[PDB]
Amino acid sequence: EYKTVIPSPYVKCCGTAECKDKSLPDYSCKVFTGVYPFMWGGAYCFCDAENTQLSEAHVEKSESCKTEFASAYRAHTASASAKLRVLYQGNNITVAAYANGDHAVTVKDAKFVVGPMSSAWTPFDNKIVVYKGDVYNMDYPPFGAGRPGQFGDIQSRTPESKDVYANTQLVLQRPAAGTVHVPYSQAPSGFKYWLKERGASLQHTAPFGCQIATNPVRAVNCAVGNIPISIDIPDAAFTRVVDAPSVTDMSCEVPACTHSSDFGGVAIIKYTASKKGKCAVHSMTNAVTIREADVEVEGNSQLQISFSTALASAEFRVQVCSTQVHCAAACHPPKDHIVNYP
Amino acid sequence: NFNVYKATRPYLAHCPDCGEGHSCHSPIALERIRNEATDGTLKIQVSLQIGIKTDDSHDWTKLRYMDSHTPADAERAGLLVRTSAPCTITGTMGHFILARCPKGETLTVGFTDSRKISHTCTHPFHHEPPVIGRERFHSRPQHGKELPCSTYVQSTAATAEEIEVHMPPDTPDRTLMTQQSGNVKITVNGQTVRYKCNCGGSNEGLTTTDKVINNCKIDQCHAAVTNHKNWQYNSPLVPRNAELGDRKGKIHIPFPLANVTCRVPKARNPTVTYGKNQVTMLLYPDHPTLLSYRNMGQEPNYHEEWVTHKKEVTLTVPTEGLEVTWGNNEPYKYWPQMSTNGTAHGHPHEIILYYYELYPTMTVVIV
Amino acid sequence: TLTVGFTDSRKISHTCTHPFHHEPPVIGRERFHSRPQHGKELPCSTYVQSTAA
Amino acid sequence: RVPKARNPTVTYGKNQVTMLLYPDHPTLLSYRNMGQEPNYHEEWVTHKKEVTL
Numbered sequence A: 001e002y003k004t005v006i007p008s009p010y011v012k013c014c015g016t017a018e019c020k021d022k023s024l025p026d027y028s029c030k031v032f033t034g035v036y037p038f039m040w041g042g043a044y045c046f047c048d049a050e051n052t053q054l055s056e057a058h059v060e061k062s063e064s065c066k067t068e069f070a071s072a073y074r075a076h077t078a079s080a081s082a083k084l085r086v087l088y089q090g091n092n093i094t095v096a097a098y099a100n101g102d103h104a105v106t107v108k109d110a111k112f113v114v115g116p117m118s119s120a121w122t123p124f125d126n127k128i129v130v131y132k133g134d135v136y137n138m139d140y141p142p143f144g145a146g147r148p149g150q151f152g153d154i155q156s157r158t159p160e161s162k163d164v165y166a167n168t169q170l171v172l173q174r175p176a177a178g179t180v181h182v183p184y185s186q187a188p189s190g191f192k193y194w195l196k197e198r199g200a201s202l203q204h205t206a207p208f209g210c211q212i213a214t215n216p217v218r219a220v221n222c223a224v225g226n227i228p229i230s231i232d233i234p235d236a237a238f239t240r241v242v243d244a245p246s247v248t249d250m251s252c253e254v255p256a257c258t259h260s261s262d263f264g265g266v267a268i269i270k271y272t273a274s275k276k277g278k279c280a281v282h283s284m285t286n287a288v289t290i291r292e293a294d295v296e297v298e299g300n301s302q303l304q305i306s307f308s309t310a311l312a313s314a315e316f317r318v319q320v321c322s323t324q325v326h327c328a329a330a331c332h333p334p335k336d337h338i339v340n341y342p
Numbered sequence B: 001n002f003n004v005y006k007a008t009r010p011y012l013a014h015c016p017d018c019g020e021g022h023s024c025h026s027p028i029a030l031e032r033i034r035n036e037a038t039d040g041t042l043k044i045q046v047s048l049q050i051g052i053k054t055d056d057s058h059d060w061t062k063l064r065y066m067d068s069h070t071p072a073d074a075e076r077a078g079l080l081v082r083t084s085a086p087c088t089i090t091g092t093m094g095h096f097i098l099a100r101c102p103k104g105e106t107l108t109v110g111f112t113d114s115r116k117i118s119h120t121c122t123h124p125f126h127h128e129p130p131v132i133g134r135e136r137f138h139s140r141p142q143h144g145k146e147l148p149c150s151t152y153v154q155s156t157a158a159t160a161e162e163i164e165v166h167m168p169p170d171t172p173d174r175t176l177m178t179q180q181s182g183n184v185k186i187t188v189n190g191q192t193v194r195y196k197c198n199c200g201g202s203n204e205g206l207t208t209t210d211k212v213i214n215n216c217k218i219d220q221c222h223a224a225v226t227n228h229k230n231w232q233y234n235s236p237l238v239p240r241n242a243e244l245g246d247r248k249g250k251i252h253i254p255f256p257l258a259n260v261t262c263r264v265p266k267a268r269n270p271t272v273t274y275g276k277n278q279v280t281m282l283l284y285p286d287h288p289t290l291l292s293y294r295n296m297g298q299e300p301n302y303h304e305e306w307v308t309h310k311k312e313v314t315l316t317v318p319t320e321g322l323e324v325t326w327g328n329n330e331p332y333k334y335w336p337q338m339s340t341n342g343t344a345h346g347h348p349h350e351i352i353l354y355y356y357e358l359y360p361t362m363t364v365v366i367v
Numbered sequence C: 001t002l003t004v005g006f007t008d009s010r011k012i013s014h015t016c017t018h019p020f021h022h023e024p025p026v027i028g029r030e031r032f033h034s035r036p037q038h039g040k041e042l043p044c045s046t047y048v049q050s051t052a053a
Numbered sequence D: 001r002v003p004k005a006r007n008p009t010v011t012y013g014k015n016q017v018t019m020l021l022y023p024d025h026p027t028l029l030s031y032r033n034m035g036q037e038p039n040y041h042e043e044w045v046t047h048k049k050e051v052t053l
């Protein structure tokens, strides 16, 4: 917002004033004749119509700008950073890295590399305008061509730079007869107004709902494309096959299953193993997923596993201790049609 | 102790409204209104000083006002302001007052004189607090979220916000004159007065002593006391001294600006009923509030409505999910799950329902 | 609405009210609510303080 | 007395005028042809409407 400075008008009697140009933004001046102002104690002066009035005004930046303002940037490209959680050696570990295929991060003797982002799509735009805590995709007018009553009506290079540019059609008018005062046709401030018609923020208009923050401005949590990850894992974690207990006498059964967004499937497997030990479990068909990663096996015992599927009839193999076991079942539709968690 | 206003003086300027329709001259003229603060508190510039006496003290009891080209002190208590109902004053210093006032369109100020007189002025100024957050709230809550917002402060030491003060030009008053059998008598009573008359002889002259110009009508001319002792801070209404634009003497404007957190109410959690791939949210506004919804995919499907009554709204979820923002509360996400148990595999086929409920219009036109 | 009230020598407040819809007529196109420092002048009916009818 | 109105800001086009109006309070805007046919129109405005003629 801008402040309009209009010092005390110059009054004169029996003589005439004159306009001297001022090298100030949107500075304007005018003169009038025949005005006969009156004050509390009576007429200012005697000259009935020979008197004259000179007025002038200009517009400057407001000190409030140092605290409140709207800033227009021309952000074009972006970089990606991401946070990952990895189950390693039976514990959750957090990693942070730039998701552009360059940053490499060492953790627990293993080297992780993430990115680059498959999709270059962004929710932002070449030109953006930011308020205190809001961001807007909007093509601001070019500097020095602000249209009055609209965003950019006053342009400043920086909040502290003294130089400014303005366009406000500051036209004066003849003062009311019998009174001493200065009228001004100051243009209404388009900046304050734009705050009134800002519209929807980009945190709602962004496709894929990429949450937007500030200081710094980032777009976060939007699902687009995929990520490549390369992990160099030292052999220390690796265990020779002989170390792992063997497995035999594999049987599978499904007392019931329910294709749903949750782990609605339960499978009971009878197994026999050489010795007590951990053993990984996996499903080699992408159509089905298993919540569990590994499990301890003692020998001729059984175990239960919770899994999620989408097939009406679930017919799949399961891998454990380098062995395959079939599993066939007929799931049923649940009752709910929509869920909150993803 | 923030004492820079030694040589200042109040105005007595043409206020736009002295009451009852006619506009006259009052000591409470106002010419500047600042409302850029998001919180809603307003600075009000005022003609007359406050918090001082003639001896330049700092007690808040009194305030300075001009009258008959002479200063006087009046009780600070009677000062008040209004827009539609009595407002609340918080700032009292120099020529600026910090006040907060409910939604109002005009703005008047009033005070009681040592003259036991009520002097009041008003300006039409549309004061509309900006709705911060979606929930258009009018009184901040016991419980709610906190958001940043601009506002003012009580500090009385500014940083390079200067306002010039200049020597008052003059005040031409003819009460000093009086006709003595065609002999005008001008009384000075201890000031510097320039008289100037179209009459001959001593037509012009600056004096500080009572004078007489014989054989001339009082209405012949006018004279003005030329005061140049205590400076008067610039305003558009006051005429200029007629020599140049600026004059030495600058004062800082107090009550700077900063942004602080402010509270904002949450919204009644709506009651949601259910249907096939469809959600029926019933909403209780409790006050004007915004409800928006958008798809979770590459297409927004943006919508945002204002609500003030209980609307029961229905949304059809897409296969990729849908999120709805209600007031300032955290948005709720709903994404579809499989549709129905109606379909089932068995001796009666009942597979068309399978391939319709799941992947409707697909794997069915394939049939 | 429109109410009037007064304080008695009885040190009592006596008040009455009538529902009367008071709507000033908008004079001119610009629906203005407080008259300006600067503006045009138009005729309009009104009263006066004379005490001799 | 009665207030004037903020002078609108007018932009341009082929045989077309785009007047942007700042009400500052409820106000009336009307337009009419200069010929034998009025083409009368008169609207009330309270927000900044950008109108085209």
Ligand SMILES: *[C@@H]1O[C@H](CO)[C@@H](O)[C@H](O)[C@H]1NC(C)=O
Pocket: A087, A090, A091, A092
């Ligand atoms: C890892 O995160 C899961 C998430 O719920 C938690 O249950 C588990 O205790 C965490 N720690 C592990 C798996 O060691």
